[PDB]
Design a binder for this molecule. Structure first.
Ligand code: SF4
Ligand code: SF4
Ligand code: SF4
Ligand code: SF4
Ligand code: SF4
Ligand code: FES
Lengths: 112, 208, 176, 22, 118, 95, 95, 385, 229, 78, 113
């Protein structure tokens, strides 16, 4: 394994793969209680699933950051964690009602 | 059509567009227009009651991590009752993408503060508070940036004179600096350089 | 495309180590660095001997304004009043009026150096090449009033420097 | 006589530092 | 009457002393362009501006005098002057009335249009 | 400028200074130079110059609208390709 | 030889000297009012009138792009000189 | 605790900050950075001016680097006019964009040294910044606040004399940086003053929108050149410093490297300038030569117009980032299509940095704070405005 | 009732008879012009009105051709633009180089429309004509040189003024609208001609050189010099 | 206040078009116009900014201005 | 109709203002001494009563509460010993000439409205 992450705020977390499977199973665990109807849910499904299989595609930490085509996925565990708090946030936004209240036509009527 | 003309990048316009419908899917509740010019510059509406819930989502990955509130650029148009036009410039670093997502507010609408969400708007806050009067949701302090101490005005309201009403000077027997009525010499001799005869038929709002 | 700064790891080798501790003690490099400042004592000092010597200036150089004449000795100004439309600080003020000879002529051209920003737009903007941003730069005054120039003072400025101004224009005119 | 100043040649320069141990 | 008379920083003196002028700006007589008649605008009434004792400059009184404001509609401008607390005076639009015209109308012996040599 | 002083100076220097003159002597450049003549400009041809082609500001168009305020193999898509890994400096790998 | 005001100070080339009543005249006291010695007016007519047997002419103010824009002076009327709109100097067609 | 206003008056305060601290013994507690002591309010002053008139304002914000500001405006104006400049103008804009970068980094280096009391480099290097002001004077007639970069491109062609002396100018300069190499870079006192001070985690940076070397020092690799080679940078060779520790020592070494980097670039820009107009063909944007305007009519007509009401942008409000050496730079136009802007906000790169300083302030002794302002390259002119 | 004709795309209930001018000007589109005037009379000289109808083999005079059903009018179409370029290249082929000394030169319609249309560069290489001045009144100075054979002023003068001293004189090159003989034009509406002049040909003497349009504020009211109000 | 702070015989030298009287910015709610409105400036130095040498010359002017000052002689005949 | 800032109806707002008056009314001597105002302290309290009178025509609770928001924000700058003595004196305008509301004098002065 490469020594030093390089970045300042980031810190190493060995055996990333397992911790990632934790995150996949958990954001899956929250999307499940989100209704299928919400437009976000199918795509976050596509994301967590395709990324989980993608982690499964290769074993070592090494080429794993090639398979996802992103340098040091050691960060994307954190992004996945933002994704986790996000998916936690999806619940209180409820299923997505298309639009609420609309501008008077003068709004967005550019020019002036 | 080339030596002077800047070439039109259709590719990025295509990708930004498709992602634009993508987002249009994702948050039907607040997202409205999905503007996509040939500058490769995407734009999106938000209802002000929908400020925070959208923005938080933006920071979190979907296919665009809208990290770093680069700007809360602000515009005031007196005509519209929703005169204010707060704009969230944004930049998803991972995807090197850029977007402009704006809103509108009235003089007494407490528009949501992204201070909790970005904190970069601790001052985009107080400027756009002070210059205007765009009251904000919940901020640690609404004390004025930039404009003085006892100063009452709200310049950038596109209202009251560019000199302002205030013009301070030190005074003798009071032994101190004191604000005074303007009395500009020479006056800003404004030129009306507006041109009758439209140069751009392609635009042109219809007489209707 | 990126480069790490520093990052490099120092040798553990004993020669190198004892050398670094020798820097930690006997300071070595300080003196080396110190030695360098000594090199300056032996160089020749860079001061120009103002004012008996003066700093180099390109012919383009912008400075005090001056209205200027035709070779005939008529003033070049036609009061086209676009230089009034350009002065970004709007220092300029012009009241064009007819000459008794009938020619357009300013009756009160004036400019204050208090608001002039010496962008030198007007040197470029004038169709008749009337007003010119002259070479002169040294003209600080005891009082504010001496800054608010009339057309008169500007004409005088065009009087004292016309040889010079025309000379620089003779050097520069192709570029514009 | 058309002209302006395009480069006349320009020899090598070293952005690289040197710090002799001497 | 959602007055923002205090919400604005303006001196009470300038809101008491004067009414503003709501209107639709006129076309140039000296120029063909109709283009600026469109879009409403509101402007404050001019005040006296004594000459500067020095250099003969303008010496403006009221600071706000150079203000100008476009509006999509008339009710829009009325709404602004109402929101802001200033008095105003509405003015009507002035589109010229259509005029029937024809090339031959210049001619004809009977119509006494005729014109002449051409 | 005496040579022994030059030796001792460069001595303390760790560098030749004579090899990179610090004070700008004789060489400089001539102030009085023959006239520029200037480039002719690409579009000063007389045979054709219709504004219809050279124009750039004329091509400007207001942005394409989508969804708008009025009027499942989707495959999640990026707005643009995600940022690439950079090279590590290469020719000077470390400072 | 600028015309002298009753107060004795010289008038401006654009005549406008202050009234004897005028208090403002006090500013010049202890100082010097300045007015240009070289009125352009005299220098206008001082010059000989150029004449050419031809017809329409083209003044440039002397100096290509060192003066006023090129201008075509007519000489339809021999009863009068053709003063430039810029140079201010006369022309005529002698025959 | 003891309440205390600081500047403007301190040389350390740069005549701008009033960051009051409620100090304890000498360790800080409260430490608020007040601002608006320089706020020139140019946003409304831009609104009532023709777009050619706006141009000086940007020399007026970044006091030091100058050409880069104007380039930051020419890009943003040419976008809306869809105008693409002749290549020579862009080789120039890079050339003096980089020489402005040398001036800016020499500024930040030597002043940061002054707060550290180094004194000497200052006098060792302004001897050089006059050497460069001689050049902006040779191309603009002004030692500084040169208006030479324009929305159409450039006012004027380069004088024949430069092309040699500038080379001469950089014939020796590397040595002048060597003289610093023998100082602070290696020097013992210097490391202690700056090592492990104001370290910033990558996330706070990405939150506040930190940019430039201020990212590159703490390891975030975000950049506005290679990510978006908006001009000739795509053709130019160079390589970007990245810090490790987030030490001010890191950011320092980075800036020294960028100075080396401009030593690399300016070589190539000297190596590659095409003959051609340095201005757009159009007379409806770019004004005619004095030789042509004074005969051809249309040239004089449009001449008269651009100098009186100017070109008209098609209507639109837009935003553009800029690769300022100090960071991302804000060009937020709002244009009704009239030559007057409707509005124009200007994000200073240093605005976010100063927003972030207090996070780095508390829990550090006052010398740390004096170190910090110099850490971030902050010229306060741009920041309040 | 009203005949249908298409502006570029939109169908229009245009009036029976009436010029293409009023047709485009109903949707708000505005044709470039000079000699024509809104309350004067159509004249075919100075064809700045040129446009091609959708099926037109060649361009029509939009200020004059009566509308009729089935036509469509692409004002923005390229050929019309080539036409306007054709006009402006010619008007400026011999115009005086005196914008700056022109009292109308700060606001001349020829300028605005020179900006709207016509190639930015000119290709003159010879010697422009220039007519002598031709006084026609103490209070209405006439620089000429500048007048563009547009004849709006005679159609004003011969008609509404009722006086006919003004008019065309000569043909071919060096033709001129300079009125015959020395005698001054006079009328009780002599001054209005000044307004009606597109260029600086008819600059008023009393106001001459005094000012430039952009500087001026335009405070409005009504005169009481007449009871006409 | 700072101007008050310095002991007699204090002098002040205005510099730059902005401090001369509001400069480029003369029309704004921002700037305070003439610096002379606050402190009694003694010599003005025109410039945006003045060439540094022009500044130097302005200081030479301040010295000549002091040189012509003569407080002691007035006191003797006071 | 539209959603309120804080207070809804006057009493939710009226409660806030009194909180404001005391917040000034006690604070005044502190200010009198920090800046060493030459004003007698009762004059200060009187001015405190006066600025609370200029806002008498307010009737929307959002206007009241927004005014006490801004007024407390001014109190921030006051208590923290920000501002300067001059800024405290800006409320007085004592350098300025008194204004004669009488119309006859308004005739005598100048062109005016
Ligand atoms: S320079 Fe002479 S001509 Fe050009 S504007 Fe100023 S005054 Fe009128
Ligand atoms: S000098 Fe610069 S600022 Fe002063 S007038 Fe001429 S152009 Fe306008
Ligand atoms: S008429 Fe219009 S165009 Fe001809 S000169 Fe006077 S202004 Fe310039
Ligand atoms: S005045 Fe001269 S220009 Fe104006 S219309 Fe009559 S002729 Fe044509
Ligand atoms: S240049 Fe010197 S004076 Fe002119 S504005 Fe910038 S700072 Fe103020
Ligand atoms: S518009 Fe009257 S003929 Fe062209």
């Amino acid at each position: 394994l490469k020594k030093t992450t390089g970045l300042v705020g980031l810190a190493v977390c060995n055996t990333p793969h397992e911790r990632l499977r934790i995150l996949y199973t958990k954001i899956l665990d929250v999307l499940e209680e989100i209704p299928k109807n919400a437009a976000y849910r199918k795509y976050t499904e596509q994301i967590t699933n395709e990324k989980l299989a993608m982690v499964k595609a290769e074993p070592d930490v090494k080429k794993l950051e090639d398979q996802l085509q992103g340098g040091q996925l050691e960060e994307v565990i954190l992004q996945a964690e933002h994704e986790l708090n996000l998916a936690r946030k999806m619940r209180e936004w409820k299923l997505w009602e298309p639009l609420v209240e609309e501008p008077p036509a003068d709004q967005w009527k550019w020019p002036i | 059509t080339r030596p002077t003309v800047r070439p039109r990048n259709d590719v990025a316009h295509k990708q930004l567009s498709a992602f634009g419908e993508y987002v249009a899917e994702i948050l039907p509740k607040y997202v409205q227009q999905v503007q996509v010019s040939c500058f490769n510059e995407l734009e999106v509406c938000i209802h002000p009651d929908g400020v925070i819930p959208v923005l938080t989502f933006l920071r979190d990955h979907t296919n665009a991590q809208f990290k770093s509130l680069v700007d809360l650029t602000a515009v005031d148009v007196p005509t519209r009752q929703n005169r204010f036009e707060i704009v969230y410039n944004l930049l998803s670093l991972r995807f090197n993408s850029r977007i402009r997502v704006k809103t509108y507010t009235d003089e007494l609408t407490p528009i949501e503060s992204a201070v909790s969400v970005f904190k970069a708007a601790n001052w985009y806050e107080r400027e756009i508070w002070d210059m205007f009067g765009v009251f904000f949701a919940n901020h640690p302090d609404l004390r004025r940036i930039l404009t003085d101490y006892g100063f009452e005005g709200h310049p950038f309201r596109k209202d009251f004179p560019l000199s302002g009403y205030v013009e301070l000077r030190y005074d003798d027997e009071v032994k101190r600096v004191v604000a005074e009525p303007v009395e500009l010499a020479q006056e800003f001799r404004k030129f009306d350089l507006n041109s009758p005869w439209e140069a751009f038929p392609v635009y042109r709002q219809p007489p209707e | 495309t990126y480069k790490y700064v520093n990052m490099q790891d120092p040798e553990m080798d004993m020669k190198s180590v004892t050398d670094r501790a020798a820097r930690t003690l006997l300071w070595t490099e300080l003196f080396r660095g110190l030695g360098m400042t000594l090199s300056y004592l032996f160089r020749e000092p860079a001061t120009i001997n103002y004012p008996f010597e003066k700093g180099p200036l390109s012919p383009r150089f912008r400075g005090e304004h001056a209205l200027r004449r035709y070779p005939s000795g008529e003033e070049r100004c036609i009061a086209c009043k676009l230089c009034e439309a350009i002065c970004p600080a709007q220092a300029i003020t012009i009241e064009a009026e007819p000459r008794a000879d009938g020619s357009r002529r300013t009756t009160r051209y004036d400019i204050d150096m208090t608001k002039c920003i010496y962008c030198g737009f007007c040197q470029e903007a004038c169709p008749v090449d009337a007003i010119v941003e002259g070479p002169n730069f040294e003209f600080s005054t005891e009082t504010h009033e001496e800054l608010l120039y009339n057309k008169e003072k500007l004409l005088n400025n065009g009087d004292k420097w016309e040889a010079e101004i025309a000379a620089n224009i003779q050097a520069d005119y192709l570029y514009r | 006589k058309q002209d302006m100043p395009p480069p006349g040649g320009y020899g090598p320069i070293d952005y690289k530092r040197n710090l002799p141990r001497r | 009457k959602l007055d923002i008379t205090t919400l604005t920083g303006v001196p009470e003196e300038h809101i008491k002393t004067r009414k503003v002028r709501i209107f639709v700006p006129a076309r140039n007589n000296m120029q063909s362009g109709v283009n600026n008649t469109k879009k409403w605008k509101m402007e404050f009434d001019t005040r006296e501006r004594w000459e500067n004792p020095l250099m003969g400059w303008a010496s403006t009184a009221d600071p706000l005098s150079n203000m100008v404001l476009t509006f999509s509609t008339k009710e829009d401008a009325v709404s602004f002057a109402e929101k802001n607390g200033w008095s105003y005076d509405i003015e009507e639009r002035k589109v010229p009335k259509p005029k029937s015209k024809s090339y031959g109308a210049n001619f004809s012996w009977n119509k006494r249009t005729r014109v002449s040599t051409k | 400028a005496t040579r022994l002083i030059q030796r001792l100076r460069n001595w303390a220097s760790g560098h030749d200074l004579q090899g990179k003159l610090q004070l700008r002597y004789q060489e400089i450049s001539k102030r009085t130079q023959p006239p520029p003549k200037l480039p002719v400009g690409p579009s000063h041809k007389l045979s054709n110059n219709y504004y219809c082609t050279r124009d750039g500001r004329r091509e400007s168009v207001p942005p394409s609208i989508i969804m708008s305020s009025q009027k499942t193999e989707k495959k999640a898509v990026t707005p643009a390709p995600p940022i690439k890994r950079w090279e590590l400096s290469s020719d000077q790998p470390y400072l | 030889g600028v015309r002298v005001s009753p107060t004795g100070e010289k008038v401006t080339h654009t005549g406008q000297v202050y009234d004897d009543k005028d208090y403002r005249r006090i500013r010049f006291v202890g100082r010097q009012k300045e007015v240009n010695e070289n009125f352009a007016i005299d220098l206008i007519a001082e010059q000989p009138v150029s004449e050419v047997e031809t017809r329409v002419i083209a003044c440039d103010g002397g100096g290509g792009a060192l003066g006023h824009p090129k201008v075509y002076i007519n000489l339809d009327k021999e009863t009068k000189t053709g003063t430039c709109g810029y140079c201010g100097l006369q022309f005529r067609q002698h025959h | 605790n003891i309440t205390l206003n600081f500047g403007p008056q301190h040389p350390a305060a740069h005549g701008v900050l009033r960051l009051v601290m409620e100090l304890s013994g000498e360790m800080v507690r409260k430490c608020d950075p007040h601002i608006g002591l320089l706020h020139r309010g140019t946003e409304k002053l831009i609104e009532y001016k023709t777009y050619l008139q706006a141009l000086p304002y940007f020399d007026r914000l970044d006091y030091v680097s100058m050409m880069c500001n104007e380039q930051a405006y020419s890009l943003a104006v040419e976008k809306l006019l869809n105008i693409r400049p002749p290549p020579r103008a862009q080789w120039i804009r890079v050339l003096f964009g980089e020489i402005t970068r040398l001036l800016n980094h020499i500024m930040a280096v030597t002043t940061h040294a002054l707060d550290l009391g180094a004194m000497t480099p200052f006098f060792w290097l302004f001897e050089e910044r006059e050497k460069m002001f001689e050049f902006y004077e040779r191309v603009s007639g002004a030692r500084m606040h040169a208006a030479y970069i324009r929305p159409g491109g450039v006012h004027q062609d380069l004088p024949l004399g430069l092309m040699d002396d500038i080379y001469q100018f950089s014939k020796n300069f590397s040595l002048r940086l060597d003289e610093l190499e023998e100082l602070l870079t290696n020097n013992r006192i210097w490391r202690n003053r700056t090592i492990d001070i104001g370290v910033v985690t990558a996330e706070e940076a990405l939150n506040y929108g930190f940019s430039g070397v201020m990212l590159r020092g703490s390891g975030i690799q975000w950049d506005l050149r290679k990510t978006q080679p908006y001009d000739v940078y795509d053709q130019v060779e160079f390589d970007v410093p990245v810090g490790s520790r987030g030490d001010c020592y890191d950011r320092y070494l980075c800036r020294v490297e960028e100075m080396r980097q401009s030593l690399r670039i300016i070589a190539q820009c000297l190596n590659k300038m095409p003959p051609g107009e340095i201005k757009v063909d159009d007379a409806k944007v770019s004004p005619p030569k004095r030789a042509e305007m004074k005969t051809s009519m249309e040239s004089l007509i449009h001449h008269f117009k651009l100098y009186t009401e100017g070109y008209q942008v098609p209507p639109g409000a837009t935003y553009t980032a800029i690769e300022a050496p100090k960071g991302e730079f804000g060009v937020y136009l709002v244009s009704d299509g009239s030559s007057r802007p409707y509005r124009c906000k200007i994000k200073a790169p240093g605005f976010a940095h100063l927003a972030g300083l207090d996070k780095m302030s508390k829990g550090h002794m006052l010398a740390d704070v004096v170190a910090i302002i110099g850490t971030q390259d902050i010229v306060f002119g741009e920041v309040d405005r | 009732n009203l005949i249908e004709v298409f502006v570029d795309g939109q169908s229009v209930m245009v009036e029976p008879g009436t010029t293409v001018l009023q047709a485009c000007e109903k949707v708000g589109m505005q044709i470039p012009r000079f000699c024509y005037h809104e309350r004067l009379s159509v004249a075919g000289n100075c064809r700045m009105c040129l446009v091609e109808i959708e099926k037109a083999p060649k361009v029509v005079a939009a200020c004059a051709m009566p509308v009729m059903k089935g036509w469509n009018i692409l004002t923005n179409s390229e050929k019309s633009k080539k036409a306007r370029e054709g006009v402006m290249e010619f008007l400026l082929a011999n115009h005086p180089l005196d914008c700056p000394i022109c009292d109308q030169g700060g606001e001349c319609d020829l300028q605005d429309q020179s900006m709207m249309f016509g190639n930015d560069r000119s290709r003159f290489l010879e010697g422009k004509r220039a007519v002598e001045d031709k006084n026609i009144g103490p209070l209405v100075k006439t620089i000429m040189t500048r007048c563009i054979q547009c004849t709006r002023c005679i159609r004003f003068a011969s008609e509404i003024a009722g006086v006919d001293d003004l008019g065309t004189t000569g043909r071919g090159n060096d033709m001129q609208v300079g009125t015959y003989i020395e005698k001054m034009f006079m009328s009780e509406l002599s001054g209005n001609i000044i307004d009606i002049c597109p260029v600086g040909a008819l600059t008023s003497k009393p106001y001459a050189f005094t000012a430039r349009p952009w500087e001026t504020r335009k405070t409005e009211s009504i005169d009481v010099m007449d009871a006409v109000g | 206040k700072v101007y008050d702070q310095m002991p007699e015989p204090r002098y002040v030298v205005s510099m730059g078009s902005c401090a001369n009287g509001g400069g480029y910015y003369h029309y704004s709610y921002s700037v305070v116009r003439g610096c002379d409105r606050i402190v009694p400036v003694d010599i003005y130095i025109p410039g945006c900014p003045p060439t540094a040498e022009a500044l130097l010359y302005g200081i030479l002017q301040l010295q000549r201005k002091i040189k012509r000052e003569r407080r002691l002689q007035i006191w003797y005949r006071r | 109709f539209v959603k309120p800032i804080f207070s809804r109806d006057m009493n939710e707002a009226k409660r806030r203002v009194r909180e404001l008056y005391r917040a000034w009314y006690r604070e005044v001597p502190n200010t009198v001494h920090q800046f060493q105002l030459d004003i007698t302290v009762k004059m200060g309290r009187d001015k405190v009563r006066e600025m609370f009178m200029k806002n008498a025509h307010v009737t929307d609770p959002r206007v009241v509460d927004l005014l006490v928001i801004k007024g407390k924000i001014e109190l921030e700058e006051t208590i923290k010993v920000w501002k300067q003595r001059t800024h405290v004196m800006r409320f007085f305008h004592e350098t300025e000439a008194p204004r004669p509301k009488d119309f006859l004098s308004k005739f005598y002065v100048g062109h005016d409205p």
